[PDB]
Amino acid sequence: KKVRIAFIAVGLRGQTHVENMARRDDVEIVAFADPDPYMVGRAQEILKKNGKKPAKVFGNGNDDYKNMLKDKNIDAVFVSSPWEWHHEHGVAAMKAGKIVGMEVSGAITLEECWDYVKVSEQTGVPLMALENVCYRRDVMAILNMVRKGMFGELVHGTGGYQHDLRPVLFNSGINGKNGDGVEFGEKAFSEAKWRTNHYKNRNGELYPTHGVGPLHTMMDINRGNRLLRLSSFASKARGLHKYIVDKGGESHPNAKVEWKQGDIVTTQIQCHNGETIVLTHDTSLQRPYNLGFKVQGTEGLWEDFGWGEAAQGFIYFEKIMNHSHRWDSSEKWIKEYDHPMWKKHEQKAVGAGHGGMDYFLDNTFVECIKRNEAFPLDVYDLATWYSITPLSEKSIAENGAVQEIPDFTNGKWKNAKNTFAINDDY
Amino acid sequence: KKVRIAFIAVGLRGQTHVENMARRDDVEIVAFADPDPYMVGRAQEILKKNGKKPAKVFGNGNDDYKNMLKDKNIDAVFVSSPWEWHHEHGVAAMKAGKIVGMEVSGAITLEECWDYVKVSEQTGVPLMALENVCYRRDVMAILNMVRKGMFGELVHGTGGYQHDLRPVLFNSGINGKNGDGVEFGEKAFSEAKWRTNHYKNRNGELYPTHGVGPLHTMMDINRGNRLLRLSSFASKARGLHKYIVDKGGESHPNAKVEWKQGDIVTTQIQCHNGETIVLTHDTSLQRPYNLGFKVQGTEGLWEDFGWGEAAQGFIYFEKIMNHSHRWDSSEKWIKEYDHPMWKKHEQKAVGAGHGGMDYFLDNTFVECIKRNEAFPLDVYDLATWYSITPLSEKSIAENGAVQEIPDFTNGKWKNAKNTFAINDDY
Ligand SMILES: NC(=O)c1ccc[n+]([C@@H]2O[C@H](COP(=O)([O-])OP(=O)(O)OC[C@H]3O[C@@H](n4cnc5c(N)ncnc54)[C@H](O)[C@@H]3O)[C@@H](O)[C@H]2O)c1
Ligand SMILES: NC(=O)c1ccc[n+]([C@@H]2O[C@H](COP(=O)([O-])OP(=O)(O)OC[C@H]3O[C@@H](n4cnc5c(N)ncnc54)[C@H](O)[C@@H]3O)[C@@H](O)[C@H]2O)c1
Ligand SMILES: CC(=O)N[C@@H]1[C@@H](O)[C@@H](O)[C@@H](CO)O[C@@H]1O
Ligand SMILES: CC(=O)N[C@@H]1[C@@H](O)[C@@H](O)[C@@H](CO)O[C@@H]1O
């Protein structure tokens, strides 16, 4: 009756998923696979806090997930591992017959992207792209407004991961602490272990899903529309080196590393039905958090400046606002057009509840498994978004040359229907 | 002692320059060249209003400017003609030995751009790019902050001409009126006569200077830095056709024209010293006016949302704001770092005065002529900005292919010094 879920990687993000599942009565958390004992310990404390019994632990090295996947009891797994581990963990899960919730990132290679889709089609095991910003309360209100016809026909959108990650990319290596040092790699903690290395060896749109995801759902990408091609420009890198010097002096070994990842990487994308999308990757500079959303059509325009609250944006609807030629605050619009799903289940996610947009993402994951239904953000969408990373790197290496984005759906995009948040439950 | 100025084209923008000159005691307005008697009449009324004597009128057809340029008394001319007339009027002026103030736009061809620079170098007659948004009060305050070191090292900027021009591109053809009809071409009035045709036959960044200009001055383009290459993406065109139908029904002949100009055209530009610039052209859709500025460096970030007032933006300075991670209103920063030029001469441009940013632009023009000094925004800058248009069209025709931007300075950019608003007078 209830879904048996396990976790490959219970680091800081894995722990969030553990909490979401631990708060449900329709799920049993069977097992964890993580080589770090400290991370496993906090995950076990989340279970104990929610009155659920401990999980079986597979903590013997990097390959112990293989032994966890042999458990026939497990229905589905969450994959919350480092970027370089996503493909190996995800395809091994589908081959073992486990439904997969895959954390966001970009692909290491374009080949990974195709292999996700091909393994999933052959095994018949579906995968969900765990993009939580698609469930953000303001974004869902805008989706509702778009579908009501309030924006008219969309022509353009922007978004991007613009979040100061300097204190996450560098720390002391002390368990549980960020922003308290200048170390990265083998001796660092959490994301500083693995993420910062990508900034050293690569230059591209390393994290596209948070900005492209919402636009995907609004412009029907892979569901009547698709992404055609892209071009990426990268600025110089200055922010990470400056951070290391300001926090840990010029004497530190890490003040000597030349970072390849430009501070701002912008990406233009053409869509089949004529829309354009501009993404921005911005994680090594001082700034407030703001994903920089813009949704623009023939009858409506929305721009945000915050982290998703009702009043943290501007909106203009010509025909509804008497051709005033002035921005309105987004506030009364986000509240009035709050998505039905949020209006119904608010108190499971906020106030008396917990998780926010993450509650709703993981709720859709579990409800689709219980109902035996296709995910609204599926393996084809994962592959598409993931492919933006390798193709952007090739664009930058070619001084901005245009790269065709593959059609991972093989013509299926033409007739596929948008099923993202089309009801008030999941 | 005083500068003798004449005007090729006294349409709506020419009239503004006429008023600026008519209010000065160090200028004599000698002559007008315009084939439209209605436009000449309002310009003559501006002189009469300011107690200055009438101008000699050259109104016999399109070529009568040639006869005006034979007047040896004329020191300088303002060129405020349609885009397709800029090159012919500008080079004929320099060849006749007249200093030129050239209105903004883009080039019709890349060849025009080179011919401006080559004619100017051969004749020895300088040309000023009349970019007024460079003198906008908030932009000048940000320039001041950048030069004070408050943004640290710049890595990225955005801007764009984002201004709803539907009521300017279509009118009834009645003299003096806009937004009152759906006609364009030979029977329309003012910009509807000529500008709208470009939307029908072309697709690109048709108007780059308002957004790139401010960034030019802040990133030292052509003055220690330069623009290397670009790539342009264009969305579908939907806004102009929809406007025609909503205002004048489907029965109108103009509801039948397929517009080539996409509603949103975005352009990525690489700079020599590592910065990137993204421009946006957005003139055929509903929206409030906002040029969408972003200035981003290692210690500061600014974004605006209005038409240039002090409180119509957000700003973040990590080290000055106690690492708060929250936007501040731009207001107290724009007021505290108001450019010296504005603080000194405020009452000549606003309040008791007139013109705003246009006062300051035309003041720099006249003061450079009186002092026999090089313009801060010169023929090389005109050519550079102008070249963004033809190269964007070629990029769009090549599905976003990267285009090299020529070096119109021939290596002079390396050692040239930024002289834009480096004093409190001009
Ligand atoms: N969508 C979101 O809101 C969101 C938020 C944070 C992180 N993330 C994503 O989640 C993923 C993980 O990020 P994080 O912040 O939790 O990093 P983290 O360093 O805290 O966690 C990674 C965990 O993976 C474990 N691990 C590494 N190799 C393994 C292996 N071979 N087998 C099993 N476990 C292994 C580590 O021991 C660690 O516990 C990344 O892809 C990141 O981008 C998404
Ligand atoms: N920088 C700014 O703030 C700003 C503002 C408005 C317009 N502009 C620019 O100014 C220019 C003109 O725009 P406008 O709004 O004044 O258009 P307009 O139609 O009102 O004026 C154009 C004038 O040029 C005249 N003209 C056409 N051909 C001529 C010729 N061969 N010889 C002499 N005169 C001729 C017309 O009769 C008309 O009076 C354009 O390049 C436009 O982009 C700049
Ligand atoms: C929605 C959101 O911004 N998510 C990001 C997540 O993807 C990851 O980058 C993390 C690093 O600490 O910071 C945020 O939580
Ligand atoms: C600074 C500013 O936005 N200038 C523009 C100008 O360039 C032109 O496009 C005009 C059309 O009516 O609208 C504005 O005044």
Domains of chain B: 1-130+339-377 (3.40.50.720), 131-338+378-426 (3.30.360.10)
Q: What beta strand segments (E) does A193-327 contain?
A: 227-234, 265-271, 276-282, 294-297, 301-304, 313-316
Question: Method used for this model?
Answer: X-ray
Distance CA B178, CA B138 (A): 29
Phi, psi of A267 (to 5 degrees): -135, 120
Q: Which residues of B touch A205 (CB under 8 A)?
A: none
Task: Choose the mutation target among B150, B151, B154, B155 for the interface with A, i.e. most A CBs under 10 Å.
Answer: B155
- Cβ partners under 8 Å of residue B127, min gap 6: B90, B94, B99, B100, B101, B102, B116, B120, B375, B378, B379, B382
> Which residues does a 6 A CB cutoff place in the pocket of ligand 2?
B 8-14, 33-36, 39, 62, 65, 80-83, 85, 103-105, 132, 190-191, 193
Measured at the CA of B200, the angle between CA B197 and CA B205, to 5 degrees, comes to 90
CA of A9 to the centre of ligand 1 (A): 6
**Helix (H) or strand (E) segment spanning residue A70:** none
What length does chain A have? 426
Query: Resolution in A, one decimal?
Result: 2.4
Residue type for position A321: M
What are the structure tokens assigned to A307, written together? 């982290």
The ligand that comes nearest to the alpha carbon of residue A79 is 1
Residue with the nearest Cα to atom 12 of ligand 4? Answer: B168
Using the atom order of ligand 3, give the atom closest to the CA of residue A178: 12
Residue B406 CB burial class (10 angstroms; 0-12, 13-18, ≥19):
middle
Using CA atoms, how far residue B170 sits from A321, A368, B156, B201, in Å, is 22, 52, 36, 16
When CB atoms are compared, the residue of B264, B276, B301 closest to A156 is B264
What 3-state DSSP class applies to A267?
A: strand
B268, A273: Cβ pair inside 8 Å? no
Distance CA A59, CA A9 (A): 10
Phi, psi of A295 (to 5 degrees): -120, 120
Order of strands across the sheet with A403-404?
A: A328-329, A313-316, A301-304, A294-297, A154-162, A276-282, A265-271, A227-234, A403-404
Residue type for position A324: S
Tokens 């505290």 label which residue? Answer: B336
Percent of chain A as helix, strand, coil, to the nearest 5: 40, 20, 45
Task: Determine if ligand 4 sits within 6 Å of the CB of residue B74.
Answer: no
Contacts 24+ apart (CB under 8 A), B413-416: B413/B222, B413/B223, B413/B224, B413/B225, B413/B226, B413/B380, B414/B224, B416/B222, B416/B223, B416/B224
Order of strands across the sheet with A127-129?
A: A56-58, A27-33, A3-8, A76-79, A99-102, A127-129
The answer to whether B299 and A286 are in contact (CB under 8 A) is yes
Residue type for position A414: K
Picking from A164, A163, A206, A169, the residue whose alpha carbon sits closest to that of residue A189 is: A169
Residue with the nearest Cα to atom 10 of ligand 2? Answer: B80
The ligand that comes nearest to the alpha carbon of residue A194 is 1
What is the DSSP pairing of strand A154-162 with strand A301-304?
unpaired
Task: Determine if ligand 1 sits within 6 Å of the CB of residue A11.
Answer: yes
The ligand that comes nearest to the alpha carbon of residue A191 is 1
**Helix (H) or strand (E) segment spanning residue B337:** none
Distance CA B259, CA B262 (A): 8
A270, B400: Cβ pair inside 8 Å? yes
Q: Which residues of B touch A270 (CB under 8 A)?
A: 233, 399-400
A316, B286: Cβ pair inside 8 Å? yes
Q: Which residues of A touch B274 (CB under 8 A)?
A: 235-236, 238
